[PDB]
Amino acid sequence: MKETAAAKFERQHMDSSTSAASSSNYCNQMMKSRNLTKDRCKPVNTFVHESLADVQAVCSQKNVACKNGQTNCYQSYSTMSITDCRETGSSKYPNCAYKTTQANKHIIVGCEGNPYVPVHFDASV
């Protein structure tokens, strides 16, 4: 089996199957099932509740600097439904624990390839 960087972005950041976080346990559930918490707790992670076609479209939208200075980042015109997963104060590997928060924000992603698609989640703004 092979996993491309594009496929890794889908696993770590896409959930097209729901319009928003489905429960208060959503982040606990997803951080585990998407294998984000293997070797250490990932302290923050964003999931985007939008079609894959709509998120892939961002790579032809507003070119902006990534927060590390690189210039293959793009900001969405549209406002997207997202969930922010943030570690709780009591979270301690291997028993990682997250609070689920909901928002509606533009996203910034880094893009590569043909088709030109997201491979990195930079920020929501």
Curated annotation (Swiss-Prot):
Primary site of residence: secreted
Chemical reaction(s) catalysed: an [RNA] containing cytidine + H2O = an [RNA]-3'-cytidine-3'-phosphate + a 5'-hydroxy-ribonucleotide-3'-[RNA]; an [RNA] containing uridine + H2O = an [RNA]-3'-uridine-3'-phosphate + a 5'-hydroxy-ribonucleotide-3'-[RNA]
Tissue: Pancreas.
Residues carrying a glycan: K2, K8, N35, K38, K42
Gene Ontology, cellular component aspect: extracellular region
Binding positions for substrate per the UniProt entry: K8, R11, K42, P43, V44, N45, T46, K67, R86
UniProt-annotated catalytic positions: H13, H120
Entry's localization field: Secreted
Coiled-coil ranges from the UniProt annotation: none
Disulfide bonds: C27-C85, C41-C96, C59-C111, C66-C73
Record keywords, A-Z: Disulfide bond, Endonuclease, Glycation, Glycoprotein, Hydrolase, Lyase, Nuclease, Secreted, Signal
UniProt family annotation: Belongs to the pancreatic ribonuclease family.
Purpose of the protein: Endonuclease that catalyzes the cleavage of RNA on the 3' side of pyrimidine nucleotides. Acts on single-stranded and double-stranded RNA.
Protein's name in the database: Ribonuclease pancreatic
Part of the intact protein present: 27 to 150 of 150
